[PDB]
Amino acid sequence: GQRIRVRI
Amino acid sequence: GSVTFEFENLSEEAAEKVKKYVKEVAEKLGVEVKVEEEEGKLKIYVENLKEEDALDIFKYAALAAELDQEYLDMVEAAIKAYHLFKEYDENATIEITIDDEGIEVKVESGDRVVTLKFKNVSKEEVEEAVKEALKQLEAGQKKVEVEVEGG
């Protein structure tokens, strides 16, 4: 299963 | 401002597309980019960007990644969220995470902590939750938790 994350 | 984008469990083909198209975009914008890939794991660090650029690149990485529309909607939701929170505090730490269940938004802003979690929710709903979170911050609240589950 895909996870995407944007940080900062 | 500097920004990190992360994908887990993309196929090799998909990750290749992400790399290639992130590269292209960045060099067109004349900016520094670091791409790191291991088995199941891709990470992109871009270093001094106008927010608008960052959020554009993130959107195109997602397209390049061949994510379906439900994932893309959450990406756009995340776009809106990142923006609105930065509008409140340009130095807020923002971590937004998307998976097949939903979306989770963590903000640290000075001494203020906001956590928003959604499952099976529209992009509209997320926006509204974000505006409400910001209302609370604006009225002097230090912590705001929101959790929403579509039925």
Residue numbers in the entry:
A (entry chain A): 1 to 8
B (entry chain B): 210 to 360
Q: What does the publication say?
A:
We describe a general approach to bind such segments in β-strand and β-hairpin conformations using de novo designed scaffolds that contain deep peptide-binding clefts. To design binders to peptides in extended β-strand conformations, we sought to create scaffolds that could provide β-strand pairing interactions to all the backbone amide and carbonyl atoms of the peptide, such that the peptide strand complements a β-sheet on the scaffold. Starting from FoldIt designed proteins with mixed α/β topology, we designed additional strands and helices to create scaffolds with a single central β-strand missing from an extended β-sheet. The sheet is buttressed by α-helices that pack on one another to support the structure in the absence of the bound peptide.
